[PDB]
Amino acid sequence: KNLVFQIGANATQQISVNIEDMGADALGIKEADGSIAALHSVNDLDVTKFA
């Protein structure tokens, strides 16, 4: 779903846009790796694991 824009009054004169963040987005291994690299942002391992 490329969030293109249209610019030229003629054809093909477009732009490409990239928007990817989410609260489940953190350290970019590839994706939400596991409990880490996305979900310390979400789940926050500092409960008692961090003790």
Partner 1 sequence: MRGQIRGLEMASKNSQDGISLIQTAEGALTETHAILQRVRELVVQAGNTGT
Contacting residues toward partner 1, per CB under 8 A: 1-6, 9, 14-15, 17
7-38: string of b/e by CB count within 10 Å (b at 16+)?
A: eeeeeeeeeeeeeeeeeeebeeeeebeeeebb
State which residue, 2 or 48, has the beta carbon closest to partner 1.
Answer: 2
State which residue, 1 or 30, has the beta carbon closest to partner 1.
Answer: 1
And the tokens for 31?
């994706």
Shortest Cβ 17–partner 1 spacing (Å): 8
State which residue, 14 or 43, has the beta carbon closest to partner 1.
Answer: 14
